[PDB]
């Protein structure tokens, strides 16, 4: 379960507001 | 027809270094983004500014692709300008620049070089392939290694199972350049 | 009257080296502080807290002199309270000691070695001989010289007719110390 | 040619915190 926090397009598998993205598919995407 | 190499230059074996990249222009062709947009699992994606859902429509004069094998958590440094030893010494992307970067871990595929600090901060988009001696001290070292004499570049060669956060990452950056009087290079129909 | 010996340690034929400097302890004897100064023409007699009277009035428990060699433009660091691995990485004196430093030229008299990077700074008064290869990078050199891996020692060249700055002259540091078990002291004439 | 701050008499030929100015008979010191 990936999900996109930027208000749109959740993402499904099998932070901060910069711009449009699709990230965090792996475990590297987050910092905490 | 006449698809851009894309996959070949991305699935390429014997990837290059990090301190010394290879900016490849992608000439006139029709490039489907489906292979890049959707892939086999993993293979993270990190695209800023303009988004593919409307790049399928609009056209771009030309594009450059750059490839490298940066390791570690410092993959966050390839982002809008952030101060970090990778960023200001292994080149920094400009703030106004709106290209996109895709990264994934490389362990099954993989002696390599990693650039060390420079005498000053460096502007975006120039290579620093350079083998000289860094002059930290006021005393002119002017030769072989000594006090305040450091030869740049480092290595991490043959590092299996060095840590899940330490595994070799690799990332590619695409930049869409629109010079005056566009010529060609559009999306798929 | 077993006069305290200084001619042998200053007029020694084989002067040893700064890498392996011969610490010489002088036992109980009576000194003649006349040959100490006004030696052969041209010399340095820098010291911190030396009036001849308090030298000649009484002598002390024991003394541990040291001798070594450097070129011209490095006699700043032999003086205490100084940095610079040119001499710091081979020698260092505390801010509280009260010995002297003596210098005299040896261009007419004259392979010699040079200390180089060391894992860390040393306190006053140790000893370090190390043929073990030094490393400044992440790759373990673990053998012959390689990337960032250098031979730990360096020569001096001793080239005649070199510049006035780039010529060697030798230095003896004299330490006067009075220690515990006071009932040994030393007796004037 | 060299002035001694300690006030003791220098040796006649034919800058730091030091005590004895019976020194500098050579061109090693001084700027």
Residue numbers in the entry:
A (entry chain C): 49 to 62, 100 to 117
B (entry chain D), C (entry chain B): 333 to 442, 450 to 528
D (entry chain A): 49 to 62, 100 to 116
Passage from the reporting paper:
Here, a nanobody called IBT‐CoV144 is reported, which exhibits broad neutralizing activity against SARS‐CoV‐2 by inducing the conformation of spike trimer dimers. IBT‐CoV144 was isolated from an immunized alpaca using the RBD of wild‐type SARS‐CoV‐2, and it showed strong cross‐reactive binding and neutralizing potency against diverse SARS‐CoV‐2 variants, including Omicron subvariants. IBT‐CoV144 binds to the lateral region of the RBD on the S protein, facilitating the aggregation of S proteins. This aggregation results in steric hindrance, which disrupts the recognition of the virus by ACE2 on host cells.
The Cryo‐EM structure of the complex between the S protein (BA.2 variant) and IBT‐CoV144 was determined to investigate the neutralization mechanism of this nanobody. Due to the inherent instability of VHHs and RBDs, a mask was created using the density of the RBD‐VHH dimeric region. Subsequently, local refinement was performed to get a density map with a resolution of 4.05 Å. The binding of the VHH to the Class 4 epitope was demonstrated, with each VHH binding to a single epitope of the RBD. The main amino acids involved in the interaction were found within the F374‐T385 loop of the RBD. The amino acids F377, C379, V382, S383, P412, and Y508 on the RBD can interact with IBT‐CoV144 by forming hydrogen bonds. To investigate the static potential of RBD and VHH, separate calculations were conducted. The results showed that the VHH at the interface of the interaction carried a negative charge, whereas the RBD had a positive charge. As a result of electrostatic interactions, the two proteins formed a complex. In addition, the interface area between two RBDs in the RBD‐VHH dimeric portion (456.8 Å2) was smaller than that in the RBD‐6M6 dimeric portion (562.7 Å2), which affected the stability of the RBD‐VHH region.
